[PDB]
Amino acid sequence: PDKTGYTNTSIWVPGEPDKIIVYNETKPVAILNFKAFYEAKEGMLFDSLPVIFNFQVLQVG
């Protein structure tokens, strides 16, 4: 925020300007966007099963 290029600048999710992540502060952040391609099974009716993603850190520097 104390430099020319970063005067009053925000960071938000691509394509969704109303969801601001960072505003006028130094917070290193990465945004992972998820998109699904699916084929439902024929005749199967289901209500509320979850889709679970697990993240495991391998190396850091």
User: Using CA atoms, how far apart are residues 24 and 6, in angstroms rounded to an integer?
Assistant: 8
Q: Which of 46, 54, 57, 60 binds other proteins (CB under 8 A)?
A: 46
Find where tokens 């439902």 sit: 40
Any contact of residue 44 with other proteins (CB under 8 A)?
Answer: yes
Neighbours of 10 (CB within 10 A): 10
Token duo for residue 33: 């966007």
Q: To the nearest whole angstrom, how small is the minimum distance from the Cβ of residue 54 to Ca ion?
A: 20
Nearer to other proteins, 29 or 51 (CB): 51
Binding residues (CB under 8 A) for other proteins: these are 42-47
